[PDB]
Amino acid sequence: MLRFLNQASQGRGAWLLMAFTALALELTALWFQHVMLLKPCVLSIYERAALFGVLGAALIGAIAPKTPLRYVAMVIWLYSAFRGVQLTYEHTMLQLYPSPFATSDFMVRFPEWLPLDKWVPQVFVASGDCAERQWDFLGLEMPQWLLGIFIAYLIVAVLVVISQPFKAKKRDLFGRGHHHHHH
Numbered sequence: 001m002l003r004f005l006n007q008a009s010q011g012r013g014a015w016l017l018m019a020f021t022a023l024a025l026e027l028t029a030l031w032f033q034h035v036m037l038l039k040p041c042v043l044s045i046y047e048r049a050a051l052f053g054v055l056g057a058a059l060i061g062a063i064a065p066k067t068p069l070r071y072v073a074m075v076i077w078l079y080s081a082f083r084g085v086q087l088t089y090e091h092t093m094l095q096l097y098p099s100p101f102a103t104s105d106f107m108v109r110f111p112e113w114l115p116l117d118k119w120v121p122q123v124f125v126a127s128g129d130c131a132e133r134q135w136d137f138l139g140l141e142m143p144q145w146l147l148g149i150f151i152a153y154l155i156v157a158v159l160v161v162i163s164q165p166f167k168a169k170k171r172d173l174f175g176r177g178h179h180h181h182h183h
């Protein structure tokens with residue numbers, strides 16, 4: 001069973017399938033705002049960057065997931081594993097445990113050395129308050145659910161990376177043809 005997982009993963013079709021998934025989610029939402037005139041927040045962008053970044057990594061790793069490239073693409077996959085998950089909880093703690101508007105919060109201050117936000121404010125500029133609820137499933141906010149899918153992706157890499165057959169293979173199964181004339 002596991003042996004196949006490494007096979008289905010080493011397949012491009014599968015890789016392309018993972019891309020469409022994150023896309024079907026990023027797009028489906030990009031329409032909800034254009035329909036319900038929703039107002040994105042600072043945190044929302046952070047979440048979008050976490051996945052948006054991974055999405056790319058999936059397209060880069062799918063270039064040769066059979067070569068050392070693994071650790072090369074896993075650089076972004078893992079980075080989001082500990083940091084993405086370690087930061088998500090913090091965001092959930094606030095929502096589940098708010099607090100006076102003392103911390104003070106407003107427009108996000110983009111960096112002056114990373115033209116990634118400044119040169120691209122179209123998908124970085126924040127507008128509204130963070131932690132607000134725009135829509136939920138089964139009574140849960142998107143941020144929470146997305147976290148559910150967020151960990152799944154992180155686990156897929158950890159397993160797809162360790163899949164390394166190491167060196168203790170098996171060559172082939174025992175008893176292939178044996179006694180069977182007419183080849």
Ligand SMILES: COC1=C(OC)C(=O)C(C/C=C(\C)CCC=C(C)C)=C(C)C1=O
Binds near residue numbers: 029033047145
């Ligand atoms: C204000 O409206 C919203 C947006 O403006 C279009 C967003 O961009 C995003 C970010 C979208 C993400 C993280 C993926 C969507 C899928 C899930 C399961 C969250 C969210 C959450 C949102 O609420």
